[PDB]
């Protein structure tokens, strides 16, 4: 397969549903490269657990933890890392209120080259245990020979775009990694980078990040087809922000408008949002504790009940993962019969203005609060007009492995979105327990 899109291993499904899945220990294995040093970008870290995931022979190599924690949370992270003298930390600046460092990425420098891993899992045991999570594995990028002047750039501009993403941190530890990336050949990369970084972007910079970055790539590198108004948009996420009092405030006015872009020319497009119901969580492998990783607060939800009419259940028979709650985030543009897709994005970005950006100043500036990162699969980058949808996730190679079932199934009238901070004491979970926050 050209796509190198993987799911994490799920403990408790039959082996056929883990054939071709990856655990973190597989990613860090010596079979992937002889590790010299690494950078782990993430939100949440269990450092003791993380070090145990590296092969014993590599556990003393330098590790950089890139995080967004402040104040007492920052002190707790430093205390976790203090026993390991090979671990350094980089605090990503979050100068806009209510932002988060969400990006999940590994930079893996080897004796043999460099690898980039963009994924969806926090660096804690539970995120790799019984959840549906996504991973993109870059090729092994070789080093450019000393004295050789070449760009090492791909047709998708991934090298310059990754360097631009890292430059936004303005961090000395990341300038070191920028210099590493400069020295490697990333030309084989077939995905486009879609990042978010905190700021207020206008003019030339408006298209660099968030939903305007997606819109720009779709304008420039996808083509519109006849009956494009009938091709739905699907968004699938683990958390929901405050979107406003009605769908015209943001969801259907700027977010959907960016997602429905195709090609360079001048809406009734269906919008499917996939988010676990209470029943999905209750009957999951983890039970109600899975909802600890589905942060949707009652304070947010009660202001936007209009949104829940867009919600569809989590179902993943195709990958044996209907009971493995999603922490992956994906967005895509299927055909009206869901047999093809015009593009697919795996990302850290949830359904929130903080992650994707919100227009300000009479539509002239895009304001983003958080760091996010994902990779976009466009048919044109593979010499194709569209991707066929792979019927069975683990079963030509030009078919794209969509990890959940299509078409998405609407919530039933008795279903409710998972809301993490209210009790569920009416039916017990798969471990015999209720949920009492
Ligand atoms: O992707 C996801 O679903 C995700 C969602 C939220 C998140 N952080 C977070 C948490 C929080 C606090 C403690 C324990 C878990 C939590 O979620 N509370 C807020 C409040 C506002 C903004 C962010 N908040 C991190 C991730 C992630 O996995 O990176």
DSSP 275-319: --BHHHHHTSSS-GGGGGGS---HHHHTT-GGGGGGEE----GGG
152 and 269 inside one domain: no
Which residue in 228, 307, 308 sits closest to 263, CA to CA?
Answer: 228
Q: How many Cβ atoms sit within 10 Å of the Cβ of residue 82? A: 10
Q: State the total domains in the chain.
A: 2
Helix locations, 8-141, DSSP H:
24-27, 47-53, 71-81
**What is the spatial distance between Cα 83 and Cα 335, in angstroms, rounded to a whole number?**
53
Distance from Cα 295 to the centre of ligand 1, integer Å? 6
103 and 11 inside one domain: yes
371 and 236 inside one domain: yes
Q: Is there a contact between 92 and 67 (Cβ–Cβ < 8 Å)?
A: yes
Resolution limit, Å? 1.5
Q: How many Cβ atoms sit within 10 Å of the Cβ of residue 178? A: 16
- 104 among annotated binding-site residues: yes
167 and 196 inside one domain: no
Q: Which domain-ending residue is among 190, 218, 238?
A: 190
236 and 294 inside one domain: yes
Q: Which domain-ending residue is among 190, 215, 234?
A: 190
Instruction: State residue 325 phi and psi, 5-degree precision.
Output: -60, 145
**What is the spatial distance between Cα 131 and Cα 364, in angstroms, rounded to a whole number?**
39
Q: Is there a contact between 317 and 124 (Cβ–Cβ < 8 Å)?
A: no
Among the options 102, 119, 184, 211, which is catalytic? 102
158 and 243 inside one domain: no
- β partners of residue 366: 201, 359
Most informative mutation of 295, 350, 372 for ligand 1 (most atoms within 8 A of CB) = 295
Q: Is there a contact between 294 and 420 (Cβ–Cβ < 8 Å)?
A: yes
288 and 146 inside one domain: no
Classified as helix, coil or strand, 256 is helix
Q: Is there a contact between 156 and 191 (Cβ–Cβ < 8 Å)?
A: yes
Domain of 158, in residue numbers = 1-190
Name the residue at shortest CA distance from atom 12 of ligand 1.
Answer: 295
For residue 312, indicate whether it is catalytic: no
**What is the spatial distance between Cα 298 and Cα 355, in angstroms, rounded to a whole number?**
20
Q: At 106, which helix (H) or strand (E)?
A: strand 105-110
Distance from Cα 385 to the centre of ligand 1, integer Å? 37
Judge if the beta carbon of residue 100 lies within 6 A of ligand 1. yes
Judge if the beta carbon of residue 43 lies within 6 A of ligand 1. yes
Q: At 158, which helix (H) or strand (E)?
A: helix 158-167
Per-residue CA distances from 342 to 119, 262, 267 (Å): 21, 9, 18
254 and 224 inside one domain: yes
Residues with Cβ within 8 Å of residue 180, at least 6 apart in sequence: 107, 109, 114
429 and 285 inside one domain: yes
For residue 327, indicate whether it is catalytic: yes
Q: Is there a contact between 111 and 142 (Cβ–Cβ < 8 Å)?
A: no
Q: How many Cβ atoms sit within 10 Å of the Cβ of residue 80? A: 18
**What is the spatial distance between Cα 383 and Cα 2, in angstroms, rounded to a whole number?**
11
Most informative mutation of 69, 100, 242 for ligand 1 (most atoms within 8 A of CB) = 100
Residue 78: Cβ-neighbour burial (10 angstroms; 0-12, 13-18, 19+): middle
Name the residue at shortest CA distance from atom 21 of ligand 1.
Answer: 98
Instruction: State residue 147 phi and psi, 5-degree precision.
Output: 90, -15
Q: Is there a contact between 296 and 286 (Cβ–Cβ < 8 Å)?
A: no
263 and 153 inside one domain: no
Which residue in 350, 344, 356 sits closest to 400, CA to CA?
Answer: 344
Q: Which domain-ending residue is among 168, 190, 212?
A: 190
Angle at 290 between CA 287 and CA 295, to 5 degrees: 140
Strand 87-91 and strand 63-67: the pairing is parallel
41 and 180 inside one domain: yes
186 and 229 inside one domain: no
């Amino acid at each position: 397969n050209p796509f190198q899109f993987y799911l994490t291993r799920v403990s408790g499904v039959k082996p056929k549903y883990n054939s071709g899945a990856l655990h973190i220990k597989d990613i860090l294995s010596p079979l992937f490269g002889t590790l010299v040093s690494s950078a782990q970008f993430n939100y949440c870290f269990d450092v003791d657990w993380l070090v145990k995931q590296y092969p014993p022979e590599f556990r003393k190599k330098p590790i950089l933890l890139v995080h967004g924690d402040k104040r007492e949370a920052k002190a707790h992270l430093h205390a976790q890392a203090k026993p390991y003298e090979n671990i350094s930390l980089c605090q990503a600046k979050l100068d806009i209120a209510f932002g988060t460092h969400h990006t999940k990425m590994m930079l893996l420098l080897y004796e043999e080259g460099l690898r980039v891993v963009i994924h969806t899992s926090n660096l804690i045991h539970a995120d790799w245990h019984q959840k549906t999570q996504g991973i993109w594995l870059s090729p092994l990028y070789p080093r450019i020979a000393d004295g050789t002047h070449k760009s090492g750039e791909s047709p998708t501009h991934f090298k310059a775009d990754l360097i631009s993403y890292l430059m936004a941190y303005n961090a000395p530890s990341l300038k070191e990694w920028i210099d590493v990336i400069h020295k490697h050949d990333l030309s084989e990369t077939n995905v486009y980078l879609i990042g978010s970084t905190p700021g207020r972007f206008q003019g030339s910079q408006k298209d660099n990040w968030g939903h305007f970055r997606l819109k720009k790539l779709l304008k420039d590198h996808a083509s519109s087809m006849p009956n494009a108004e009938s091709w739905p948009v699907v968004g699938q996420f683990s958390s929901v922000g405050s979107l406003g009092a009605d769908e015209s405030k943001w969801l259907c006015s700027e977010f959907k408008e960016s997602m429905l872009t195709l090609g360079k020319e001048s809406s009734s497009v269906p919008l499917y949002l996939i988010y676990p119901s209470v029943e999905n969580v209750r009957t999951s492998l983890e039970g109600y504790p899975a909802g600890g990783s589905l942060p949707y607060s009652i304070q947010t939800a009660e202001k936007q009940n209009w949104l829940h009419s867009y919600f569809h259940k989590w179902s993943a028979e195709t990958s044996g993962r209907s009971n493995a709650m999603p922490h992956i985030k994906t967005y895509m543009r299927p055909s009206p019969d869901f047999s093809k897709i015009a593009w697919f994005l795996v990302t850290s970005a949830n359904l929130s203005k903080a992650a994707w950006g919100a227009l300000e100043k009479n539509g002239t500036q895009l304001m983003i609060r958080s760091y996010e990162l994902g990779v976009l699969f466009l048919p044109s980058a593979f010499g194709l007009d569209s991707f066929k949808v792979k019927q069975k996730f683990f079963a030509p190679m030009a078919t794209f492995p969509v990890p959940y079932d299509l078409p998405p199934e609407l919530y039933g009238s008795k279903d409710r979105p998972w809301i993490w901070n209210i009790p569920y004491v009416k039916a017990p979970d798969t471990h015999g327990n209720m949920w009492v926050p």
